[PDB]
Design a protein around this motif. Structure first.
Motif, PDB file in Angstrom:
ATOM      1  N   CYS A 153      20.455  -7.122   5.466  1.00 24.95           N
ATOM      2  CA  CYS A 153      19.853  -6.226   4.492  1.00 24.95           C
ATOM      3  C   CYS A 153      18.346  -6.416   4.437  1.00 24.95           C
ATOM      4  O   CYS A 153      17.594  -5.473   4.686  1.00 24.95           O
ATOM      5  CB  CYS A 153      20.454  -6.389   3.102  1.00 24.95           C
ATOM      6  N   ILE A 154      17.895  -7.626   4.112  1.00 25.74           N
ATOM      7  CA  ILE A 154      16.469  -7.818   3.874  1.00 25.74           C
ATOM      8  C   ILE A 154      15.646  -7.385   5.083  1.00 25.74           C
ATOM      9  O   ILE A 154      14.539  -6.865   4.938  1.00 25.74           O
ATOM     10  CB  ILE A 154      16.145  -9.286   3.542  1.00 25.74           C
ATOM     11  N   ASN A 155      16.194  -7.663   6.263  1.00 23.66           N
ATOM     12  CA  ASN A 155      15.517  -7.422   7.528  1.00 23.66           C
ATOM     13  C   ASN A 155      15.351  -5.938   7.758  1.00 23.66           C
ATOM     14  O   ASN A 155      14.262  -5.463   8.073  1.00 23.66           O
ATOM     15  CB  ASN A 155      16.325  -8.018   8.680  1.00 23.66           C
ATOM     16  N   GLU A 156      16.450  -5.208   7.603  1.00 20.53           N
ATOM     17  CA  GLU A 156      16.386  -3.751   7.578  1.00 20.53           C
ATOM     18  C   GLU A 156      15.350  -3.262   6.571  1.00 20.53           C
ATOM     19  O   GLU A 156      14.539  -2.389   6.877  1.00 20.53           O
ATOM     20  CB  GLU A 156      17.759  -3.160   7.250  1.00 20.53           C
ATOM     21  N   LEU A 157      15.385  -3.830   5.370  1.00 16.06           N
ATOM     22  CA  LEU A 157      14.322  -3.622   4.394  1.00 16.06           C
ATOM     23  C   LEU A 157      13.150  -4.564   4.646  1.00 16.06           C
ATOM     24  O   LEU A 157      12.571  -5.114   3.709  1.00 16.06           O
ATOM     25  CB  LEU A 157      14.856  -3.815   2.973  1.00 16.06           C
ATOM     26  N   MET A 158      12.805  -4.744   5.916  1.00 18.09           N
ATOM     27  CA  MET A 158      11.408  -4.736   6.340  1.00 18.09           C
ATOM     28  C   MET A 158      11.099  -3.511   7.194  1.00 18.09           C
ATOM     29  O   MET A 158      10.070  -2.860   7.012  1.00 18.09           O
ATOM     30  CB  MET A 158      11.076  -6.015   7.112  1.00 18.09           C
ATOM     31  N   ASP A 159      11.995  -3.203   8.126  1.00 18.42           N
ATOM     32  CA  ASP A 159      11.946  -1.937   8.846  1.00 18.42           C
ATOM     33  C   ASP A 159      11.362  -0.829   7.977  1.00 18.42           C
ATOM     34  O   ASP A 159      10.287  -0.304   8.264  1.00 18.42           O
ATOM     35  CB  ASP A 159      13.342  -1.543   9.333  1.00 18.42           C
ATOM     36  N   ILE A 160      12.078  -0.480   6.913  1.00 22.01           N
ATOM     37  CA  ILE A 160      11.852   0.783   6.219  1.00 22.01           C
ATOM     38  C   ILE A 160      10.470   0.817   5.573  1.00 22.01           C
ATOM     39  O   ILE A 160      10.073   1.823   4.987  1.00 22.01           O
ATOM     40  CB  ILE A 160      12.920   1.031   5.137  1.00 22.01           C
ATOM     41  N   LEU A 161       9.742  -0.289   5.687  1.00 23.72           N
ATOM     42  CA  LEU A 161       8.682  -0.609   4.739  1.00 23.72           C
ATOM     43  C   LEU A 161       7.517  -1.310   5.430  1.00 23.72           C
ATOM     44  O   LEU A 161       6.571  -1.752   4.777  1.00 23.72           O
ATOM     45  CB  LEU A 161       9.223  -1.481   3.605  1.00 23.72           C
ATOM     46  N   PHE A 162       7.592  -1.409   6.753  1.00 27.94           N
ATOM     47  CA  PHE A 162       6.414  -1.265   7.601  1.00 27.94           C
ATOM     48  C   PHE A 162       6.104   0.204   7.867  1.00 27.94           C
ATOM     49  O   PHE A 162       5.032   0.696   7.515  1.00 27.94           O
ATOM     50  CB  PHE A 162       6.610  -2.010   8.923  1.00 27.94           C
ATOM     51  N   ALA A 163       7.048   0.899   8.493  1.00 30.42           N
ATOM     52  CA  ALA A 163       6.721   1.914   9.488  1.00 30.42           C
ATOM     53  C   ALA A 163       5.743   2.941   8.927  1.00 30.42           C
ATOM     54  O   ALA A 163       5.044   3.621   9.679  1.00 30.42           O
ATOM     55  CB  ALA A 163       7.986   2.598   9.983  1.00 30.42           C
ATOM     56  N   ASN A 164       5.698   3.047   7.603  1.00 35.27           N
ATOM     57  CA  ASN A 164       5.980   4.307   6.927  1.00 35.27           C
ATOM     58  C   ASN A 164       4.752   4.867   6.217  1.00 35.27           C
ATOM     59  O   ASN A 164       4.760   6.006   5.747  1.00 35.27           O
ATOM     60  CB  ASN A 164       7.130   4.136   5.932  1.00 35.27           C
ATOM     61  N   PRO A 165       3.654   4.026   6.138  1.00 31.67           N
ATOM     62  CA  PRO A 165       3.273   3.703   4.753  1.00 31.67           C
ATOM     63  C   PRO A 165       3.082   4.956   3.904  1.00 31.67           C
ATOM     64  O   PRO A 165       2.010   5.560   3.927  1.00 31.67           O
ATOM     65  CB  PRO A 165       1.938   2.970   4.909  1.00 31.67           C
ATOM     66  N   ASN A 166       4.118   5.337   3.162  1.00 36.51           N
ATOM     67  CA  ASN A 166       3.984   5.587   1.732  1.00 36.51           C
ATOM     68  C   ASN A 166       4.740   4.560   0.895  1.00 36.51           C
ATOM     69  O   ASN A 166       5.789   4.063   1.304  1.00 36.51           O
ATOM     70  CB  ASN A 166       4.461   7.000   1.388  1.00 36.51           C
ATOM     71  N   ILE A 167       4.199   4.248  -0.278  1.00 35.84           N
ATOM     72  CA  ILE A 167       4.849   3.322  -1.199  1.00 35.84           C
ATOM     73  C   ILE A 167       5.901   4.031  -2.044  1.00 35.84           C
ATOM     74  O   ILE A 167       5.604   5.010  -2.730  1.00 35.84           O
ATOM     75  CB  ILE A 167       3.828   2.642  -2.131  1.00 35.84           C
ATOM     76  N   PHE A 168       7.132   3.533  -1.990  1.00 29.58           N
ATOM     77  CA  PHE A 168       8.309   4.391  -2.027  1.00 29.58           C
ATOM     78  C   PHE A 168       9.173   4.090  -3.247  1.00 29.58           C
ATOM     79  O   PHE A 168      10.382   4.321  -3.236  1.00 29.58           O
ATOM     80  CB  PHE A 168       9.132   4.228  -0.748  1.00 29.58           C
ATOM     81  N   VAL A 169       8.544   3.573  -4.298  1.00 28.77           N
ATOM     82  CA  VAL A 169       8.904   3.940  -5.663  1.00 28.77           C
ATOM     83  C   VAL A 169       7.667   4.283  -6.484  1.00 28.77           C
ATOM     84  O   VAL A 169       7.602   3.991  -7.679  1.00 28.77           O
ATOM     85  CB  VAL A 169       9.678   2.809  -6.365  1.00 28.77           C
ATOM     86  N   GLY A 170       6.687   4.907  -5.838  1.00 31.50           N
ATOM     87  CA  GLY A 170       5.698   5.706  -6.539  1.00 31.50           C
ATOM     88  C   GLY A 170       4.650   6.279  -5.606  1.00 31.50           C
ATOM     89  O   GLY A 170       4.966   6.731  -4.505  1.00 31.50           O
ATOM     90  N   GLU A 171       3.397   6.259  -6.049  1.00 34.47           N
ATOM     91  CA  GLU A 171       2.349   7.068  -5.433  1.00 34.47           C
ATOM     92  C   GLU A 171       2.877   8.429  -4.986  1.00 34.47           C
ATOM     93  O   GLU A 171       3.335   8.586  -3.854  1.00 34.47           O
ATOM     94  CB  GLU A 171       1.725   6.329  -4.247  1.00 34.47           C
ATOM     95  N   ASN A 172       2.807   9.408  -5.882  1.00 35.69           N
ATOM     96  CA  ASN A 172       3.097  10.792  -5.527  1.00 35.69           C
ATOM     97  C   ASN A 172       2.520  11.170  -4.167  1.00 35.69           C
ATOM     98  O   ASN A 172       1.534  10.589  -3.716  1.00 35.69           O
ATOM     99  CB  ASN A 172       2.570  11.742  -6.605  1.00 35.69           C
ATOM    100  N   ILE A 173       3.143  12.150  -3.519  1.00 36.11           N
ATOM    101  CA  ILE A 173       2.484  12.909  -2.462  1.00 36.11           C
ATOM    102  C   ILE A 173       2.623  14.410  -2.693  1.00 36.11           C
ATOM    103  O   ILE A 173       1.792  15.023  -3.363  1.00 36.11           O
ATOM    104  CB  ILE A 173       3.052  12.558  -1.074  1.00 36.11           C
ATOM    105  N   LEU A 174       3.676  14.995  -2.134  1.00 40.83           N
ATOM    106  CA  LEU A 174       3.747  16.441  -1.959  1.00 40.83           C
ATOM    107  C   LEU A 174       5.071  16.999  -2.469  1.00 40.83           C
ATOM    108  O   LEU A 174       5.162  18.170  -2.837  1.00 40.83           O
ATOM    109  CB  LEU A 174       3.549  16.813  -0.487  1.00 40.83           C
ATOM    110  N   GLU A 175       6.095  16.152  -2.489  1.00 34.85           N
ATOM    111  CA  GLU A 175       6.520  15.492  -3.718  1.00 34.85           C
ATOM    112  C   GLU A 175       7.225  14.173  -3.420  1.00 34.85           C
ATOM    113  O   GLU A 175       7.292  13.288  -4.273  1.00 34.85           O
ATOM    114  CB  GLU A 175       7.440  16.408  -4.528  1.00 34.85           C
ATOM    115  N   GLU A 176       7.750  14.049  -2.206  1.00 32.59           N
ATOM    116  CA  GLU A 176       9.172  14.255  -1.962  1.00 32.59           C
ATOM    117  C   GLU A 176       9.886  12.930  -1.714  1.00 32.59           C
ATOM    118  O   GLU A 176       9.870  12.403  -0.601  1.00 32.59           O
ATOM    119  CB  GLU A 176       9.382  15.195  -0.772  1.00 32.59           C
ATOM    120  N   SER A 177      10.513  12.397  -2.758  1.00 30.25           N
ATOM    121  CA  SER A 177      11.325  13.206  -3.659  1.00 30.25           C
ATOM    122  C   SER A 177      11.973  12.347  -4.740  1.00 30.25           C
ATOM    123  O   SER A 177      12.949  11.640  -4.483  1.00 30.25           O
ATOM    124  CB  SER A 177      12.399  13.966  -2.877  1.00 30.25           C
TER     125      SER A 177
END
Lengths: 150, 135, 129, 84
Positions: free
Chosen positions: B82-106
RNA sequence: GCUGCAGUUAAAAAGCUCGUAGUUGGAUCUUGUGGAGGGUUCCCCGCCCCUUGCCUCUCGGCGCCGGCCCGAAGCGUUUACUUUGAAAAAAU
RNA sequence: UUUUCGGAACUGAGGCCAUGAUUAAGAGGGACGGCCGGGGGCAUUCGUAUUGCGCCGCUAGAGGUGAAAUUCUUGGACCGGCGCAAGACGGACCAGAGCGAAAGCAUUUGCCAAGAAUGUUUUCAUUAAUCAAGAACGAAAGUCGGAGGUUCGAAGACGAUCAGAUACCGUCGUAGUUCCGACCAUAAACGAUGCCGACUGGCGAUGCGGCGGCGUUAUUCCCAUGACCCGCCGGGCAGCUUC
C-alpha cells in the motif's frame, strides 16, 4: 409512565448542583459558537451537537459556557430548520411503516403500531401550532408527510 | 462508476462504523479494495484515489485489536505494498490531491478543514509505520 | 401527574407518626406547605423543620412528636363566609374546645380562630387536631 | 428500617450507594478524564460514557468504544477526574 | 349515599387499546426598624430601593413669606374569591 | 397674505436600560449507545410419526372391550424388511421462565419493518392524566366463494350395555378440521379484582440491563468480551413470613 406502552422506568439524566466552569476548561463563550456553527453545516442536529461537544471536548454542557441554549444560538443566525427535529423523527418513522404495510397487508401488528405513532404526531402538532411555531392551517396527511420528510 | 457521488457517500458510510463493537474489522479493508480495483477511470484521477488510499492503508492499520502486539508479517508486507503504491500516485503527478483547486476535478475538501494535514496525513502514516516496525 | 401536592404531603406525616417515627422526607416542597406547617408548629404539634434546597423544587424534613393525631386535606377548595363556618367546624373537629381548621384569606394563611377576629372569609385548605 | 433513623446527614457511601435521583442532592455518577497516550501525543479530555468513537490525530484513529454504559478505553493510560 | 354508599366471592369494572368533547393538572416572581392600638420581637405614617404607582397640569380654595407647597382629575394588565355599602311588597 | 402655536400622522441615523430568556419536575416527548425477547410479517430449511401405494419374507388369526360383537383375513390380513407418495404436525428438551394492548406466540436460516428495560453532566421546556362521539385488533364455532382433504370427527348407518338407552363404550362415516380471499364481534374473552399518582414491614430467589469486587476458568503466553462465585443499583413475572 409511558404514553403508548404500559411500562414505567427511570433512566433520566441528573445534573450536579454546582455550575461554575468548572475552572478547568477553555474556549471562551465565543470559541464555542464557531465550534457549533461548523457542525450544523454537516447535518448535525441540536441533540447530536451537544453530544459531540460533551464526549470529546472540554465542555460539561453548552449552557454554562454560554448564556443561551444550543438551539437559540442557531436560531439567532437564522440557520435553524423550519420544523423541530422531534416532529421530523416521528414523521420519518411512519413513512417506512406505511411502505412495509403496502408490501405486506397481513402485518396487523404494524398497522396497530402505526395508529399510536400517527396519533402521537397530531398531539405534538397541537402544541406547536397553538404557540405560533407552525402555520394555523397546517395538517398532517399522507401527501404532506411524503413531501415534508424529503 | 458514476461521478465520484455514490462513490464518495459510500466512502462516508464505510468510514463511519469505525470503532464500534461490530466491525468485521478486516472486510472493511476488503471493501475499500472494492472501490478501487473496480475504479478504472480516468483523468479524474489518477487523482483523487490517493486519499481513499490513505484511509484504506488506514484500514491496513486499524484491524488490530489494540496497541500492544505486532503485525502478522503478511499484514506487514501488505502495509508496505500500500504505502509504496502511495508513493507512486504522489510523485508522478504533482497536483496536491486533497486540495489546491484546479479546473476542478474533482472534489470538495476545502470545505473540511484544510487540504493539508490530510495532506500531512502521509508523514503520520510513515511514522506510525516506523513505530510498528519498532514493535 | 401529582395533581395536588399538599394532599399527597399530609398522608406521609400522618402514616409516619402512627408507626412511630420522628423524621420524615416530604417532596416536592411547595411554598403552600411551608406556611401551613408554620401555623401547625406555633400551636405545638410538630417541632422545627429543615428545608433542604435543590434547584428542582427542594425537599423538606420535619421533626415531629406524638402530639399530632392526624392532619387531613379537604379538596376541592370551598369558600366560607363566616356563617358557613360553624357548620364546617362541627363536622371536621372532635370538639369545640380544640382543633384548628386552617384556611387562606387575603390577609394570609391562618387558623379559623384568627380569621374570625379580622372578619375575613376565604378558601379552606385542610384541618388538623 | 429501625424506625428512628437519621436522614439529615447520610453516610459517605453506605447511604450514598443509592440511586442518584433518590439521594438528597442529585449527583451524576460520571466523570471526565485527562488522557495523553502515545498513539496520539496530545492531552485529550474525554467523558467516561463516551457514547461515540473518540478519534485520534496521530497514527491511531480510535481511542474509545461505546458500550452499554461506561466506555472501554484502550492501551493508553491517561487518567484523571479531576475533582468531579 | 353532595355532606355520605357499593362493585374479588353476596346485585356489580366495557374483551382490549387508541381518541375529540368534558373534567383535572408540578415547581418558581419581597424582609427587617421609631410613633400609634395589643403582647415582650409580632398584627395607621413612614424609612434602606418601594410604600396607597404618577404626573400635569388647569380651572374654581387652604396655606407661608411675585415666589413656593398639598387634597380633587386620568389609573395601577383583566376576573373569580372575600369583606363593606346601596336597593330590595305585605301577610307568613 | 405669511409665519408662529397647538394637535395628529408617517421616516431615517445616534445616545440611555445590568439593554429583555426562572428551573429541567425521582412529569412527558425526542435524539444517541450497547443489548434483550416462543413479539409480528415474508421467504427458506429439517425431523419423526400417521395414512396410502409398490416390492420382498414367514403363515392364521387380527381389531376391540369390563366382558363382546360389528369389521378385517390364504387374490396373505396382522407381523418383519426395503423404497416411494400425500397431507397433517413441531415431542422429550419446555420451567409459579420470556415477549405481546388483549386475543395470543416454540424445528433451520435469511430478509422486512416494530418495541420494552437499562446507560447518558445530550435535546425540547409543561408538550400531561382519564375519557361521550368516533376508530383498530379481537379465541373457537358459524356463513359465502376457490384450493386441499392425511388425521380426528357433529350428522348419519351399525354392534353392544339397559326393563327402556335416540346416551356413556366399540366399528364405519358426511359437514367441519387445513390453506387463500370476504363476512360474523361473541367466551368462566377470570387475577371473576379499571386506569394514573403518593405514602407505609421483613426475607430469600428468578429473568434483563448497568456498576463494584478475594478468586478459580476459556484462549494466543498475557487486564479483548465468554462461562462459575460474591455484593450493589434500576424496572419485571412471582413466592415465603407477621398483633
Amino acid at each position: 409512565g409511558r404514553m403508548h406502552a404500559p411500562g414505567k422506568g427511570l433512566s433520566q439524566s441528573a445534573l450536579p448542583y454546582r455550575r461554575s466552569v468548572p475552572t478547568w476548561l477553555k474556549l471562551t463563550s465565543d470559541d464555542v459558537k464557531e465550534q457549533i456553527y461548523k457542525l450544523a453545516k454537516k447535518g448535525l442536529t441540536p441533540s447530536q451537537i451537544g453530544v459531540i461537544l460533551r464526549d470529546s471536548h472540554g465542555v460539561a454542557q453548552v449552557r454554562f459556557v454560554t448564556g443561551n441554549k444550543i438551539l437559540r444560538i442557531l436560531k439567532s443566525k437564522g440557520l435553524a430548520p423550519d420544523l423541530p427535529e422531534d416532529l421530523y423523527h416521528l414523521i420519518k418513522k411512519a413513512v417506512a411503516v406505511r411502505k412495509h404495510l403496502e408490501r405486506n397487508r397481513k402485518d396487523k401488528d404494524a398497522k396497530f403500531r402505526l395508529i399510536l405513532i400517527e396519533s402521537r404526531i397530531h398531539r405534538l402538532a397541537r402544541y406547536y401550532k397553538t404557540k405560533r411555531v407552525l402555520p394555523p392551517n397546517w395538517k398532517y396527511e399522507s401527501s404532506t408527510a411524503s413531501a415534508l420528510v424529503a | 462508476e458514476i461521478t465520484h457521488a455514490v462513490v464518495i457517500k459510500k466512502l462516508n458510510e464505510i468510514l463511519q462504523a469505525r470503532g464500534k463493537k461490530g466491525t468485521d474489522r478486516a472486510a472493511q479493508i476488503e471493501l475499500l479494495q472494492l472501490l478501487v480495483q473496480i475504479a478504472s477511470e480516468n483523468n479524474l484521477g489518477e487523482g483523487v484515489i490517493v486519499k481513499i488510499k490513505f484511509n484504506i492503508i488506514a484500514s491496513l492499520y486499524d484491524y488490530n485489536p489494540n496497541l500492544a502486539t505486532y503485525m502478522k508479517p503478511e499484514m506487514w508486507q501488505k502495509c508496505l505494498d500500500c504505502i509504496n503504491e502511495l508513493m507512486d500516485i504522489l510523485f508522478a503527478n504533482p497536483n496536491i490531491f486533497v486540495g489546491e483547486n484546479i479546473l476542478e476535478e474533482s472534489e470538495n475538501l476545502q470545505n473540511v478543514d484544510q487540504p493539508l494535514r490530510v495532506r500531512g496525513c502521509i508523514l503520520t502514516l510513515v511514522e506510525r509505520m516506523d513505530e510498528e516496525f519498532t514493535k | 401527574v401529582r395533581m395536588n401536592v399538599l394532599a399527597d404531603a399530609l398522608k406521609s406525616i400522618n402514616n409516619a407518626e402512627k408507626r412511630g417515627k420522628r423524621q420524615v422526607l416530604i417532596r416536592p416542597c411547595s411554598k403552600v406547605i411551608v406556611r401551613f406547617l408554620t401555623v401547625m408548629m406555633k400551636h405545638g404539634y410538630i417541632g422545627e423543620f429543615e428545608i433542604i434546597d435543590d434547584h428542582r423544587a427542594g425537599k423538606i424534613v420535619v421533626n415531629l412528636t406524638g402530639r399530632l393525631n392526624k392532619c387531613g386535606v379537604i379538596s376541592p377548595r370551598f369558600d366560607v363566609q363566616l356563617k358557613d363556618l360553624e357548620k364546617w367546624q362541627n363536622n371536621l373537629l372532635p370538639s369545640r374546645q380544640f382543633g384548628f381548621i386552617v384556611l387562606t384569606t387575603s390577609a394570609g394563611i391562618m387558623d379559623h380562630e384568627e380569621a374570625r377576629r379580622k372578619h375575613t372569609g376565604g378558601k379552606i385548605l385542610g384541618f388538623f387536631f | 428500617m429501625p424506625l428512628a433513623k437519621d436522614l439529615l446527614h447520610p453516610s459517605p457511601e453506605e447511604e450514598k450507594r443509592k440511586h442518584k435521583k433518590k439521594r438528597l442532592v442529585q449527583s451524576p455518577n460520571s466523570y471526565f478524564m485527562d488522557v495523553k497516550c502515545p498513539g496520539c501525543y496530545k492531552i485529550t479530555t474525554v467523558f467516561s460514557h463516551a457514547q461515540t468513537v473518540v478519534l485520534c490525530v496521530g497514527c491511531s484513529t480510535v481511542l474509545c468504544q461505546p458500550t452499554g454504559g461506561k466506555a472501554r478505553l484502550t492501551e493508553g493510560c491517561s487518567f484523571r477526574r479531576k475533582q468531579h
